[PDB]
Amino acid sequence: SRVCQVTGKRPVTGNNRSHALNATKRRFLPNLHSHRFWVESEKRFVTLRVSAKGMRVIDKKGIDTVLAELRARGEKY
């Protein structure tokens, strides 16, 4: 499930569009990566499957806060 654990980003659909303007179904999908984040608050490595962006979100908000959600929302981690 190409799905960003932090941000909710899943794949989306659109068209392609030639010069001839031809519509053809396509998919956009999240730049996902799955990373080993160091918590320390847990002295452990939680490894989330993330989108660069999710990563930025973590880099901002803060890991302990992100992990806050998910748990807050039932998710594993």
Binding site: F37, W38, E40, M55, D59, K60, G62
Partner: protein
Amino acid sequence: MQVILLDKVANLGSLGDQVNVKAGYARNFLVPQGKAVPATKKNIEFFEARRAELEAKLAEVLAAANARAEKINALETVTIASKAGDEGKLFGSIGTRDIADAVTAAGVEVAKSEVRLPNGVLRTTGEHEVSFQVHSEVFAKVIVNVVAE
């Protein structure tokens, strides 16, 4: 990515300065490895409140006994002296506890030789005023009265 530092840390570090560091270096090494922290603003004060409650706080709490010599500005009672010799001139020296024998009942009592003037300590008249070790900065002022017996 900005973040402020904890430990030294090369090409930037400074026990708490404000550096701007490449994304990865930080979320991958600087932290989750204690050596810095997201400049979360909540922090730029959290770690500036130091640069105030310190570098202007405990650098002023250094002035609580000016020159240490406060009310010793009228010379001290000459209990004994510091010695003499050579029938007129001088000859005998100050033991590793003998410039107190005179000022030997004023402030507090101690006994060590933080020698300050690495000379043969001039032998002449008697009453001099240099400084001696009173701390990491200031000094002191008193005199010396010989004994005629």
